[PDB]
Point group: C3
Chain length 94, copies 3
């Protein structure tokens, strides 16, 4: 599993949601953050994705969140060492 995190313009959240839903990605977690540099509001999207699917997810988010203008933000991929499903206590394979 990989954690895909993106810091996006807030008005692109619905486009990102549509792209992820269309791909069948579950577990989208959203929070509001401040992009300092005093600040511009941003949305942080996070989703944990299988190793097999993460690059597709990165590309989908990138295309949906893009404007080509400054401030578009970045997508980060971090390795997840272990993921546990709380419902069943099961550790991941994918």
């Amino acid at each position: 599993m990989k954690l895909v995190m993106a810091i996006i313009k807030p008005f692109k959240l619905d486009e990102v949601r549509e792209a992820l839903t269309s791909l069948g990605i579950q577990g989208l977690t959203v929070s509001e953050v401040k992009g300092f540099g005093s600040f511009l509001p941003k949305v942080k999207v996070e989703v944990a994705v299988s190793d097999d699917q993460y690059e597709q997810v990165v590309e989908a988010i990138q295309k949906a969140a893009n404007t080509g203008r400054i401030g578009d933000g970045k997508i980060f991929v971090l390795d997840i060492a272990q993921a546990v499903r709380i419902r069943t206590g099961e550790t991941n394979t994918e």
Copy 2:
């Protein structure tokens, strides 16, 4: 050190707190996030734990946050490359 992150049902936060406190875990950091898919409120818990203790922490959170119903969420473990204590400027060994 490992970063343990869990996305839980908000009404399980106090159970998770009790479990972590009983284990002597410090540094619990909590935020409110939105589980989209428009959304259900969730709580994100994060704690940085020694390599020696992280699996116990994962298990404690899982048992405390479990209902067995859909939406229970996941726990993610990410490797921390370096942790610095701000109070003293000291880098971790554990």
Copy 3:
């Protein structure tokens, strides 16, 4: 790239901002979190930094956020496997 995350006392945010701005670091992302243990308000700062610069960033944050008293918090460095600039769709080298 590395993700540098710090959980700091809220009244040190402006000092941390000054230190990062002076170093020419961009992309500072800030959120408000709760340090439980019911809680004290904290600020979470996050910035993705090149491998070449991350230790300087860690040191700058540490010095700016320090009081020497309990509750100062920690800085965590996590490896980023891939970073994509949303504006251009470009993957990182640094």
